[PDB]
Amino acid sequence: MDISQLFHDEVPLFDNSITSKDKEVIETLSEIYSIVITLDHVEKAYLKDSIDDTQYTNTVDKLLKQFKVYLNSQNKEEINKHFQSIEAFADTYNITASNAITRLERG
Amino acid sequence: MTDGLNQLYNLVAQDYALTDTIEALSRMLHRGTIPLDTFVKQGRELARQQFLVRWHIQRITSPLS
Numbered sequence A: 001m002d003i004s005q006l007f008h009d010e011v012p013l014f015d016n017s018i019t020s021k022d023k024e025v026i027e028t029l030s031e032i033y034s035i036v037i038t039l040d041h042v043e044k045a046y047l048k049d050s051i052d053d054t055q056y057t058n059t060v061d062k063l064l065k066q067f068k069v070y071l072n073s074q075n076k077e078e079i080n081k082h083f084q085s086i087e088a089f090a091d092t093y094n095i096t097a098s099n100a101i102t103r104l105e106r107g
Numbered sequence B: 001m002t003d004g005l006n007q008l009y010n011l012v013a014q015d016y017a018l019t020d021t022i023e024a025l026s027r028m029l030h031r032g033t034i035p036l037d038t039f040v041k042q043g044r045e046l047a048r049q050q051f052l053v054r055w056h057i058q059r060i061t062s063p064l065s
């Protein structure tokens, strides 16, 4: 088949049969991701000595606490279900956040 | 193009615009042009949207690309 047939009609963001709980899980993952990405840039900017030492500590403390709140919800099993598939996408397209991941490991 | 191909192209364009905007804010942050609190607020919102755009792209392209 050609592309015109393969990509004929619009595909919805979520399957029309997605449960309320499943959708909630994905939305929680979007928030977790935003913290990971945002934190990665903050960590990097701190390495360049462009951020105030107090402001950095407070901001990263807040981001770490928020990350913990999100993770400790959504059955807790259902979030790990997706983590591996997020890694597969990230590896395919070289999406990295290694400074954030290192910080989240410790705190 | 078909509706489907139009949709995919627009999502890829949106992904690139979101990356462009996050990077612009990131450069400002490293430079000191914007406060840390502003980067975090605006940066988090854009990254949130970017996750969902990418989720959407994956849902479309899941037929072995």
Ligand SMILES: CCCCCCCCCC[N+](C)(C)[O-]
Residues within 6 Å of the ligand: A093, A094, A095, B012, B015, B054, B057, B061
């Ligand atoms: C089908 C297009 C998939 C969109 C996601 C691609 C991520 C681009 C990665 C950009 N980067 C320069 C960091 O490798």
Ligand SMILES: CCCCCCCCCC[N+](C)(C)[O-]
Residues within 6 Å of the ligand: B006, B009
């Ligand atoms: C990768 C090159 C393909 C460019 C396709 C441009 C799509 C034009 C869409 C036009 N329209 C106004 C109807 O959205």
Ligand SMILES: CCCCCCCCCC[N+](C)(C)[O-]
Residues within 6 Å of the ligand: B014, B017, B018, B021, B046, B049, B053
């Ligand atoms: C699903 C809607 C996603 C639309 C994303 C459009 C990206 C442009 C973002 C522009 N701006 C930097 C002002 O937020």
Ligand SMILES: CCCCCCCCCC[N+](C)(C)[O-]
Residues within 6 Å of the ligand: B021, B024, B025, B034, B038
């Ligand atoms: C790439 C978009 C440019 C962002 C510029 C940041 C202006 C933020 C103004 C809001 N603030 C309350 C901090 O004055």
Ligand SMILES: CCCCCCCCCC[N+](C)(C)[O-]
Residues within 6 Å of the ligand: A085, A086, A089, A090, A095, B051, B054, B055, B058, B059, B062
């Ligand atoms: C930048 C991280 C975005 C990763 C998106 C991962 C998509 C997984 C979608 C799973 N699904 C079976 C619904 O296609």
Ligand SMILES: [Mg+2]
Residues within 6 Å of the ligand: none
């Ligand atoms: Mg530019």
